[PDB]
Amino acid sequence: MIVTPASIKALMTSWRKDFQGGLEDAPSQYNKIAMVVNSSTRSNTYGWLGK
Amino acid sequence: MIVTPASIKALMTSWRKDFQGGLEDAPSQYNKIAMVVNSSTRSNTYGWLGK
């Protein structure tokens, strides 16, 4: 039996990438309650007329 | 009545291979809760990056 040191025995591992994405984020569900509007300048102004 | 010895009349039986199966063992159901990876050294090292 060859008495190898501790560091050499610790280097004798194989790298596996099964844990790559970590834990996935929660589902996205903001489109159900919000209205999406695109702005083109410094700010948007909205205006409506009373009855 | 013919007096046959016990050694001759002990051969007067029928061999049946009906118990050959025996008692079956429990089902394998480790594939629903575990993931199978391979290895090629003393151990396996897994690493992932944070968010």
Residue numbers in the entry:
A (entry chain B), B (entry chain C): 1 to 51
Give verbatim excerpts from the published study on this entry.
Myophage Mu is a representative of contractile nanomachines with a simple tail baseplate. It has the capacity to infect a range of intestinal bacteria and has extensive applications in genetic engineering research. Using cryo-EM, we resolved the three-dimensional (3D) structures of the G(+) type phage Mu in both its extended state and urea-induced contracted state, the latter lacking the baseplate, at near-atomic resolutions. The structure of extended Mu can be divided into four distinct regions: the DNA-containing head, the connector complex, the tail, and the baseplate.
Using icosahedral reconstruction method, a 4.2 Å resolution map of the extended Mu head was generated. The local reconstruction method was employed to improve the resolution of the 3-fold capsid of the head to 3.2 Å. The Mu head is constituted by 415 copies of the MCP gp34, which are organized into 11 pentons and 60 hexons, thereby forming an icosahedral shell with a triangulation number of seven. The MCP gp34 adopts a canonical HK97-like fold. According to the domain nomenclature of MCP gp5 of HK97, each gp34 can be divided into four domains: N-arm, E-loop, P-domain, and A-domain. An asymmetric unit of the icosahedral head comprises seven gp34 monomers (one hexon and one-fifth of a penton). The superimposition of the seven gp34 monomers in an asymmetric unit revealed considerable conformational changes in the N-arms and E-loops, which ultimately led to the formation of capsomers, hexons, and pentons that are assembled into the icosahedral capsid. Despite the absence of cement proteins at inter-capsomere interfaces, complex and extensive interactions are observed around the 3-fold and the quasi-3-fold axes, including hydrogen bonds, salt bridges, and electrostatic interactions. Analogous interactions that reinforce the inter-capsomere stability within the head, independent of cement proteins, have been identified in A-1(L), T7 (47), and R4C.
